[PDB]
Design an enzyme around this catalytic site. Sequence first.
Site, PDB file in Angstrom:
ATOM      1  N   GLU B  55       0.846  -1.211   0.000  1.00  0.00           N
ATOM      2  CA  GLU B  55       0.000   0.000   0.000  1.00  0.00           C
ATOM      3  C   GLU B  55       0.870   1.247   0.000  1.00  0.00           C
ATOM      4  OE1 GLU B  55      -4.162   0.372   1.894  1.00  0.00           O
ATOM      5  OE2 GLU B  55      -2.728   1.184   3.391  1.00  0.00           O
ATOM      6  N   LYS B  57       0.657   4.710   1.201  1.00  0.00           N
ATOM      7  CA  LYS B  57      -0.065   5.421   2.277  1.00  0.00           C
ATOM      8  C   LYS B  57       0.948   6.279   3.019  1.00  0.00           C
ATOM      9  CE  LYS B  57      -1.270   3.075   6.091  1.00  0.00           C
ATOM     10  NZ  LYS B  57      -2.119   2.134   6.862  1.00  0.00           N
ATOM     11  N   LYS B 116      -7.978   2.540  -2.874  1.00  0.00           N
ATOM     12  CA  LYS B 116      -8.298   2.401  -1.442  1.00  0.00           C
ATOM     13  C   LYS B 116      -8.992   3.703  -1.049  1.00  0.00           C
ATOM     14  CE  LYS B 116      -8.071  -0.765   1.649  1.00  0.00           C
ATOM     15  NZ  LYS B 116      -7.022  -1.389   2.468  1.00  0.00           N
ATOM     16  N   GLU B 165     -14.569  -5.796   1.828  1.00  0.00           N
ATOM     17  CA  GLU B 165     -14.034  -5.756   3.213  1.00  0.00           C
ATOM     18  C   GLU B 165     -15.096  -6.264   4.194  1.00  0.00           C
ATOM     19  OE1 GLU B 165     -12.363  -2.356   6.174  1.00  0.00           O
ATOM     20  OE2 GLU B 165     -10.897  -3.036   4.605  1.00  0.00           O
ATOM     21  N   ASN B 186     -10.321  -7.373   7.581  1.00  0.00           N
ATOM     22  CA  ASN B 186      -9.537  -6.312   8.264  1.00  0.00           C
ATOM     23  C   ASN B 186      -9.243  -6.778   9.691  1.00  0.00           C
ATOM     24  OD1 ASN B 186      -8.082  -4.081   8.982  1.00  0.00           O
ATOM     25  ND2 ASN B 186      -9.480  -2.626   8.012  1.00  0.00           N
ATOM     26  N   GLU B 216      -5.707  -8.179   5.981  1.00  0.00           N
ATOM     27  CA  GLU B 216      -5.319  -6.747   5.939  1.00  0.00           C
ATOM     28  C   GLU B 216      -4.976  -6.209   7.332  1.00  0.00           C
ATOM     29  OE1 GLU B 216      -8.539  -5.094   2.772  1.00  0.00           O
ATOM     30  OE2 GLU B 216      -9.219  -5.153   4.885  1.00  0.00           O
ATOM     31  N   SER B 217      -3.967  -5.342   7.401  1.00  0.00           N
ATOM     32  CA  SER B 217      -3.695  -4.373   8.494  1.00  0.00           C
ATOM     33  C   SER B 217      -2.877  -5.022   9.609  1.00  0.00           C
ATOM     34  CB  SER B 217      -4.951  -3.744   9.057  1.00  0.00           C
ATOM     35  OG  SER B 217      -5.613  -2.955   8.092  1.00  0.00           O
TER      36      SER B 217
HETATM   37  O1  LIG Z   1      -4.907   2.425   9.020  1.00  0.00           O
HETATM   38  C1  LIG Z   1      -5.676   3.095   9.741  1.00  0.00           C
HETATM   39  O2  LIG Z   1      -5.301   3.800  10.686  1.00  0.00           O
HETATM   40  C2  LIG Z   1      -7.120   3.163   9.364  1.00  0.00           C
HETATM   41  C3  LIG Z   1      -7.990   3.871  10.190  1.00  0.00           C
HETATM   42  C4  LIG Z   1      -9.322   4.000   9.889  1.00  0.00           C
HETATM   43  C5  LIG Z   1      -9.805   3.453   8.720  1.00  0.00           C
HETATM   44  C6  LIG Z   1      -8.984   2.728   7.874  1.00  0.00           C
HETATM   45  C7  LIG Z   1      -7.638   2.554   8.180  1.00  0.00           C
HETATM   46  N1  LIG Z   1      -6.799   1.825   7.358  1.00  0.00           N
HETATM   47  C8  LIG Z   1      -6.900   1.734   5.919  1.00  0.00           C
HETATM   48  C9  LIG Z   1      -6.397   0.414   5.333  1.00  0.00           C
HETATM   49  O3  LIG Z   1      -6.467   0.480   3.896  1.00  0.00           O
HETATM   50  C10 LIG Z   1      -4.958   0.109   5.795  1.00  0.00           C
HETATM   51  O4  LIG Z   1      -4.191   1.235   5.468  1.00  0.00           O
HETATM   52  C11 LIG Z   1      -4.351  -1.159   5.189  1.00  0.00           C
HETATM   53  O5  LIG Z   1      -5.118  -2.290   5.608  1.00  0.00           O
HETATM   54  C12 LIG Z   1      -2.901  -1.381   5.569  1.00  0.00           C
HETATM   55  O6  LIG Z   1      -2.767  -1.548   6.993  1.00  0.00           O
HETATM   56  P1  LIG Z   1      -1.309  -1.366   7.693  1.00  0.00           P
HETATM   57  O7  LIG Z   1      -0.390  -2.526   7.158  1.00  0.00           O
HETATM   58  O8  LIG Z   1      -0.882   0.021   7.326  1.00  0.00           O
HETATM   59  O9  LIG Z   1      -1.566  -1.535   9.152  1.00  0.00           O
END
Ligand SMILES: O=C(O)c1ccccc1NC[C@@H](O)[C@H](O)[C@H](O)COP(=O)(O)O
Lengths: 470, 461
Positions: B55, B57, B116, B165, B186, B216-217
């Site tokens: 990503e 970001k 995204k 999602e 997520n 994800e995340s």
């Molecule tokens: O990442 C956040 O802080 C957040 C907060 C509120 C809503 C959505 C959010 N994330 C968006 C989502 O696309 C994440 O950026 C990806 O899943 C990547 O997660 P990461 O590997 O950065 O933890």
Amino acid sequence: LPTVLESIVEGRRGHLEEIRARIAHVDVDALPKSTRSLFDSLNQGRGGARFIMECKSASPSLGMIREHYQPGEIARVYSRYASGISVLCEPDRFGGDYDHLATVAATSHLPVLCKDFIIDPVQVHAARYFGADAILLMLSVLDDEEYAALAAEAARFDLDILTEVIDEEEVARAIKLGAKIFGVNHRNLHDLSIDLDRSRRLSKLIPADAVLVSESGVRDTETVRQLGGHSNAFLVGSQLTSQENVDLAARELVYGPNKVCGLTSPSAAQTARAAGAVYGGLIFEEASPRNVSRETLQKIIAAEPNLRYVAVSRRTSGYKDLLVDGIFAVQIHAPLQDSVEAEKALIAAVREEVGPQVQVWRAISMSSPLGAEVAAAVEGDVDKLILDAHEGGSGEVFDWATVPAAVKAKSLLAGGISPDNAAQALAVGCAGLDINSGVEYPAGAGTWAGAKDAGALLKIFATISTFHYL
Amino acid sequence: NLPTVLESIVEGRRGHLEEIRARIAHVDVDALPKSTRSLFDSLNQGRGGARFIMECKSASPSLGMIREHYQPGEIARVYSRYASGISVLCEPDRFGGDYDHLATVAATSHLPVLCKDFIIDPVQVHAARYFGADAILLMLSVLDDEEYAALAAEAARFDLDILTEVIDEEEVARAIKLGAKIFGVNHRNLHDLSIDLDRSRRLSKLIPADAVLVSESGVRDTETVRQLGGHSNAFLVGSQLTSQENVDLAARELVYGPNKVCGLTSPSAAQTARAAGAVYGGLIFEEASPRNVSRETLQKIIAAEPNLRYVAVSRRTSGYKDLLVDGIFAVQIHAPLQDSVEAEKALIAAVREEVGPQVQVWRAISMSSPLGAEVAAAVEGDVDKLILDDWATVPAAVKAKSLLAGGISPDNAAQALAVGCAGLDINSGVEYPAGAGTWAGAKDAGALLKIFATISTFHYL
Ligand SMILES: O=C(O)c1ccccc1NC[C@@H](O)[C@H](O)[C@H](O)COP(=O)(O)O
Ligand SMILES: O=C(O)c1ccccc1NC[C@@H](O)[C@H](O)[C@H](O)COP(=O)(O)O
Ligand SMILES: O=C(O)c1ccccc1NC[C@@H](O)[C@H](O)[C@H](O)COP(=O)(O)O
Ligand SMILES: O=C(O)c1ccccc1NC[C@@H](O)[C@H](O)[C@H](O)COP(=O)(O)O
């Protein structure tokens, strides 16, 4: 008495025992097959302008090309522009090794071609073990029986073949042997002379349905655009690996020396560069809606340092004040002066101001009937001409039949260039396009009106990328 | 009273719709070109296929500013080496995103690109396609069945894949009924921002076995990838990558783990090791070693491949200061084991003081010599890494901090990885054997491709 090619091949023959020992521990029958098709990557029509970009650090014709050789950094650049990567594996004349091939294979998603003088199955085995998807087989070195035996060895590992032909007899042999990819070498490999006309000539004999690759001697987009109509693909090496900035050299070759002018944001500059622009224009003129401060200018350059930035102004002095770290040129956009002799003094004053590390470009209003005459007179005093409508940022055209043939190789064509008229603009035959309001958001776009439209940048550079003369 | 983070984001995005409609008002939507890159096909490589959606970001609600000096084009170039997809944040007010970022990535990379965004209106689907997306996110936490189906039908007009999602059993049931082909689980709750890495394992029991599951995340390290890999087609990873100055080194560290290719003696070997996926390169400074490198060779290797972290390896007990040149990230103490634990701690303290605080200090321990295991546990807190030459009750503390060494080869790599150390230390097992003539003992580029391909998709069973 031995030709350059005969020297290279006899040299390679003397390497075979070392190659046999190098891979003696490898179980050849268990080698993984190639899963990347160079044929399907190149098989996008005559005019498709696919590039095979070559990692090459040295050659018999040029000597040492790139002393500080990072094939993996070159391969990352090539992975943006190319449909295949060629890697010289020959060590004594080309600085090559199988380690370069493996480095490229692990770095890139593209099909990888081992560019070697192949005379023995062991070289096919080595190619596959070190990551190749394709091998070169040369009809100038192999008879029909040697070709079939090496082609069958390649087929065992799903390696594609680039079949190299230099004449009418090799084309007829390749057809008889069922070649699917014809590589026309413009270089005579015995005496190193170049004949760029050879691919047009042999395209008359090569089947209409076969993939034709035009190899060697391609230095500029004008050559690409002349040869595009009879070519599926170009193989290009030294024009790229001879330049410090390989990514700028790739853009200059594939797309040409085009400028996206009137940049007012970091993200517009990043979009322009991604799309394929060589030059970014920054406007220093109070009256302009595209005017930028020293602050914006340095933010844009830091955000996207891989453009060559042109500082544009209507002023006649004070170009010294527009200079910062990253300014490659200044573009004198003053109105046409009284005489040729005053244009020549205006130019030499600016060249004095900016010094010899900074280029000097001159915009000429071709909306005037005096434009053509100043252009030919000042051509040798500037690094580039901009052939423009009115006095810059008009978004209107002039009569493009008004451009004298003399100056085209030094000119960007400017004035209302947009995705809709881009093909017709390229057909004039100037080295590059100057692109400004025709890729801006129109007046109804709200707060985005006048900003660079990333969708318009994608369309115009996709048009440019495959343009060839008809 | 206060809106949740998700609610604020979605309402902020509703207030951008007028700006988006005007921004693409000149676009002939009916004539937009279709996407020709399939995220589905890229990700549909089996559970344990370890495909990455990486990503772009620059900021998040949870982290604030992540990467101020943001070059989406340069990040997409890095990602195009490792990823099977690129996600680009298009949300401007909390994530620092714009459609220009989307376009920059689409023009830079060969991969399928995911917009995204918090999509609630068809204009966002039209914009996504115009600015070069191949795929969009639709969130069942945001959309009812009717809103989802209207937006998924807009997406289908343009051959846009959908990342659906889901965060709970209710949402997966809805996703199955809506016909979803790609399930995005997520780990992050977008109401309270909590992370539950165990949520992909739990929802994988309810998601169709033939469906693409993206975890994800919150994924920060390879131990997490290797643990979650068995129930995942793919991972979506952002801030672990964009929070690091060197995104290429962070990508290797995440995908492959903190592995070292030791005994580098040529520039091409170092370049091959970096390309294959190595994070560290070892250089040996011992006149006894056939892998001993001169001052001159050392500086040629580093200059030819500056994107490995170089580790100076010596059997000496002192004089680590005159191994240091620019590019030396760590020193590896490969001295024979000392008489006692206290002599080991004191040997390490003395090396810390020679190299100073910018140079990591590593200790090689022979695990045969039975005091070996005790020393390892004793000195773990005092070194940045252990090099371990049982493995049933070697502490988890020691494993997380350890490269496993001992003839690691292409043939035994998978068995070595099953031990559960952070990384592998690779040397003679990727060298040409004695019959290779002038190549005997050099690094075998073909063995490096094979061992790193095995690392790239290893997960625990
Ligand atoms: O990442 C956040 O802080 C957040 C907060 C509120 C809503 C959505 C959010 N994330 C968006 C989502 O696309 C994440 O950026 C990806 O899943 C990547 O997660 P990461 O590997 O950065 O933890
Ligand atoms: O390039 C040479 O000097 C030469 C000399 C003898 C034999 C082969 C040669 N060239 C190898 C061939 O792979 C060429 O590098 C490619 O076709 C690329 O040509 P370039 O674009 O660098 O002119
Ligand atoms: O665009 C402006 O506002 C401006 C102002 C002062 C001087 C030059 C300017 N334009 C820079 C110039 O190179 C423009 O890119 C060309 O004139 C083409 O503009 P276009 O006609 O495509 O909008
Ligand atoms: O490799 C050498 O020759 C050498 C010489 C002196 C000191 C340490 C040495 N080895 C470096 C060390 O990090 C090795 O990678 C590990 O010990 C594993 O070696 P392997 O058994 O896999 O060849």
